[PDB]
From a paper:
We provide the structural and biochemical analysis of the lactonase GcL (WP_017434252.1), isolated from the thermophilic bacteria Parageobacillus caldoxylosilyticus. The binuclear center, common to all MLLs, is coordinated by five histidine residues and two aspartic acid residues.
The Gly156Pro variant exhibits larger changes in preference, with a 254-fold drop in catalytic efficiency against C6-HSL. Intriguingly, the decrease in substrate preference does not change linearly with the increase in chain length but shifts 2.3 and 6.8-fold for C8- and C10-HSL, respectively. The conformational change in this loop may be responsible for the altered substrate preference of the enzyme. We used MDpocket70 to locate the hydrophobic/hydrophilic regions of the cavity along with the MD simulations of C6-, and C8-HSL in complex with wild-type GcL and Gly156Pro variant. Interestingly, the end of the C6-HSL acyl chain, which is the most mobile part of the substrate, lays in the same position as the rearranged residue Glu155 side chain, creating strong repulsion and destabilizing the substrate.
Numbering used by the authors:
A (entry chain A): 9 to 283
B (entry chain C): 8 to 283
């Protein structure tokens, strides 16, 4: 029945120390060690399920980068996003003959700039988000805090567009969204509140969408290599190991949030789908 | 009780500033290969000559730490090089104050990192006070022959062989009144598995909090708080820092960081005097 699509929403670059912390430490021999600006894919996942279309993540807002962009210049220069018009989410969905208003559920893994970019589009969906992540982002907004990963203007848009929210409580069990689609409540780690997705496809079988719970295969290991972007180190480690257990017990693949090698090997919306 | 508190200079260490201050200098689009720096910082310990008995806070690095025949692994020596003279060695610092290791009643181990638990093995007449989670963590690295850089296998080996007398601070244990005006602070998990601090109330100087690696430097402390790269429990670290700030305010105490070069220079070291 279900069809799962991988949509390419462009690329982002940043200090590798964000991705893998202390990836290249200074030594007595390399006292002035240098980092690297690494490139990684931003992507989203559409599940065209009989019970309704489910969208996982929403990438960046088209009006993010640029001198007249939503992102602060310090953010733009730290986490530059590069994307043709075909990469924009609205376009990727159009290509699939899917309108925003057709989306029943949006699962926001978290509310970082490269995941919650286009939430404002989905005014007919229920937006599922971790309550702690929602609280965290709302505070940034209210306190006009200068947090690089949370876009004041994006949040401003969510409120103005009157999105319909469904917060996953801190100690809430996983949610059965649809047949073979379960929202996993990962809790605090990479961010305040992380959500994942387990999808059971008839043919493909089990998929875990880990998002930023696991940046890359290098993150996953073993051994685990945590990021520099991190709120709760203990929770982050617990989440990874938990994912590892779930993958084993359910014989699922783990789809990382920003692994280039894996993304290349994915079947994109333009090419086809998983079923 | 009219005690005397000594700061002993146990050398200097250097390491990537990212260890000390996480993401201190992130690469950007127009600076994509941003480079880090190798910052130098002091290793010190504190002796409290107290009428009820002598209390030592931290023990610095082991004399046979560095070198080809050293206890530290080469990768450790290269990432966290320790430079010190014979006078900087704790045993010598104590000797110059006419103190023998056997005269130490209590050793408080802030944690069991290489630069704080180096010389525990000296104090075979003392009760070593350590956080149980820290002790457990270190013992695991030992038993698993794990290669954690901050935990020295040979140091731990020595503690066991010397039959040290331990007193573990339990995870949910209250502060310990060690002596009049000396309280062991249970900071719990953060920088490491289990952090201990000290609150000292001196007649003349007033209140001092020894934070060790709960707070690396004034830069760490802020505000704003700038967390380290060497972290186990991020949330616990931040809670601890905020807790120290509150205690400091309420008790009107100075906060002595673990490795603040500037603060260290201002201290009256053991070669010059003490704090009453
Ligand atoms: Co993120
Ligand atoms: Co330490
Ligand atoms: Fe991300
Ligand atoms: Fe230290």
């Amino acid at each position: 029945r279900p069809k799962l699509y991988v949509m390419d929403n462009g690329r982002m670059r940043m200090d590798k120390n964000w991705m893998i912390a202390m990836h290249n430490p200074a030594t007595i021999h390399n006292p002035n060690a240098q980092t690297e600006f690494v490139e990684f894919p931003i992507y989203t996942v559409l599940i065209d399920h009989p019970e309704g279309k489910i969208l996982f993540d929403t990438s960046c807002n088209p009006n993010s980068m640029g001198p007249q962009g939503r992102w602060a210049e310090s953010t733009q220069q730290m986490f530059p996003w590069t994307a043709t018009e075909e990469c924009y989410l609205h376009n990727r969905l159009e290509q699939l003959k899917v309108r925003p208003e057709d989306i029943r559920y949006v699962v926001a893994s978290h509310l970082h700039l490269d995941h919650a970019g286009c939430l404002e589009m989905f005014t007919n969906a229920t937006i599922i988000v971790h309550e702690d992540e929602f609280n965290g982002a709302l505070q940034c907004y209210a306190r006009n805090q200068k947090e690089p990963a949370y876009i004041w203007a994006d949040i401003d848009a969510w409120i103005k567009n009157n999105l319909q929210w469904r917060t996953v409580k801190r100690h809430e069990d996983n949610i059965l969204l649809a047949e073979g689609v379960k929202v996993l409540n990962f809790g605090s780690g990479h961010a305040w509140g992380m959500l994942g997705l387990h999808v059971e496809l008839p043919e493909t079988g089990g998929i875990i969408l880990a998002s930023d719970a696991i940046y890359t295969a290098e993150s996953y290991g073993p051994p685990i290599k945590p990021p520099g972007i991190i709120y709760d180190s203990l929770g982050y480690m617990n989440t990874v190991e938990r994912i590892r257990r779930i993958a084993q017990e359910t014989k699922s693949q783990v789809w990382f949030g920003h692994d280039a090698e894996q993304f290349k090997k994915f079947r994109k919306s333009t090419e086809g789908y998983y079923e």
